[PDB]
């Protein structure tokens, strides 16, 4: 959740309908948009941010909602336009091969800047003490992780969470709607829409 990938999409035709084809028990909460009107507006670049946050912290992944995971790992301003999907994958992620495969951070010297990654290496500092790169009192690794055993409750299973950002800058006609066809019939006087002409 502290080191999240950011994929940059290019000119294409995004079909926002396969999002609800995966395994059940998945959220589709949007902010500022709607899935019914998703394929109506035009966006230049869409960014996908994948992270493995789980538990009762998906509700606080929203503009103006702090918490314990969206406080020093991911911050969203009050302008987010996208839909978050948090389907649960408790079949290929939770395994006994390794419990520290995923990571998780904690409090820092300051709050994270919205939409900024905080890949660090340095050890945490309590404010007044010599660390010297050792694991002692008041100097410990803030990357406190958790285990993933295939016996936990519903509130601790691996949740694959990915958010989508919708930007709108001075750009040409980029991704906007999958398509729209109506099985053209040629027998009478009827309306037509040939890619703009109405």
């Amino acid at each position: 959740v502290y080191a999240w990938n950011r994929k940059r999409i290019s000119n294409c035709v995004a079909d926002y309908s396969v999002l609800y084809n995966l395994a059940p028990f998945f959220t589709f909460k949007c902010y500022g948009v709607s899935p019914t009107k998703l394929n109506d507006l035009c966006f230049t670049n869409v960014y996908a941010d994948s992270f493995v946050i789980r538990g009762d912290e998906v509700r606080q992944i929203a503009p103006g909602q702090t918490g314990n995971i969206a406080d020093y790992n991911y911050k969203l301003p009050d302008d987010f336009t996208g839909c978050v999907i948090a389907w649960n994958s408790n079949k290929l992620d939770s395994k006994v091969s390794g419990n520290y495969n995923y990571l998780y951070r904690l409090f820092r010297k300051s709050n994270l800047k919205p939409f900024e990654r905080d890949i660090s290496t340095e050890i945490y500092q309590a404010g007044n003490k010599p660390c010297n790169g050792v694991a002692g009192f008041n100097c410990y690794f803030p990357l406190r992780s958790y285990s993933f055993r295939p016996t936990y409750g519903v509130g601790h299973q691996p949740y694959r969470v990915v958010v989508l950002s919708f930007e709108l800058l001075h750009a040409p006609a980029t991704v906007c709607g999958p398509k729209k066809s109506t099985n053209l019939v040629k027998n009478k006087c009827v309306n037509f829409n040939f890619n703009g002409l109405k």
Partner: antibody, heavy 126, light 108 residues
């Protein structure tokens, strides 16, 4: 073509920490997995960790869990590996190996290295 | 997993060599090989026991049958003396299991 230059490495006291880097050049740092593998002098190699094309950890060894943390930075095209609580059995040539396949979405997990580098001698003693 | 390799295999430069890597039930998972010149960086050799990368001649070959993967190198020369390793995935433990490489030395 591919130039996997590796930076970071030297003499450090047992129990300290350091940051290793591997700046990629020649290919696209968004579709090829890069791993970390050490090689003790004249005592074979040993896989440390690795990350896929996206930000994803593929696991560690049976002796580096909890102490090592690998991170990927697609913006600067460089792979980083954090080492905590180094001991006497961590003196080896840590390499920066890439992957041949493009790691398509629907396949089977099978990673094999194709491009190798030179490595940095990370010696840990008093 | 745990792979077992011969500590050293020598052969005259007139015939082929026999480098094997055996395990417990390694009959379906892919078997990859590597060659590392002494001092230089490890180079890639025939992988998946069914194809070779670009640049490797036809002399290098591989084959797996049940619990033994044989890296059959043909017409071994002096410039082929290197440390050969075999790779496996072992998705059961989410690791990359290597093994003690074999020091191929052209005798004679």
């Amino acid at each position: 073509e591919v130039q996997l230059v590796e930076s970071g490495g030297g003499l450090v006291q047992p129990g300290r920490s350091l940051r290793l880097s591997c700046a990629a050049s020649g290919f696209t740092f968004d579709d090829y997995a890069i791993h970390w593998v050490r090689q003790a002098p004249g005592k074979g190699l040993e896989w440390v960790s690795g990350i896929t094309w996206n930000s994803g950890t593929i696991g560690y060894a049976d002796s580096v869990k909890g102490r090592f943390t690998i991170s990927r930075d697609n913006a600067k095209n460089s792979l980083y590996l954090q080492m905590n609580s180094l001991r006497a059995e961590d003196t080896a040539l840590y390499y920066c190996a890439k992957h041949h396949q493009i790691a398509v979405a629907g396949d089977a997990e099978d990673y094999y290295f194709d491009y190798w580098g030179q490595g940095t001698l990370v010696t840990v003693s008093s | 997993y745990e792979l077992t390799q011969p500590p050293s295999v020598s052969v005259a430069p007139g015939q082929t060599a026999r480098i094997t890597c055996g395990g417990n039930n390694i009959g379906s998972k892919s078997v990859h090989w590597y060659q590392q010149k002494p001092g230089q960086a490890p180079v890639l050799v025939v992988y998946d026991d069914s194809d070779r990368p670009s640049g490797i001649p036809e002399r290098f070959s591989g084959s797996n049958s049940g619990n033994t993967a044989t890296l059959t190198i043909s017409r071994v020369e002096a410039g082929d003396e290197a440390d050969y390793y075999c790779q496996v995935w072992d998705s059961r433990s989410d690791r990359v299991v290597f093994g003690g490489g074999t020091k191929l030395t052209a005798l004679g």
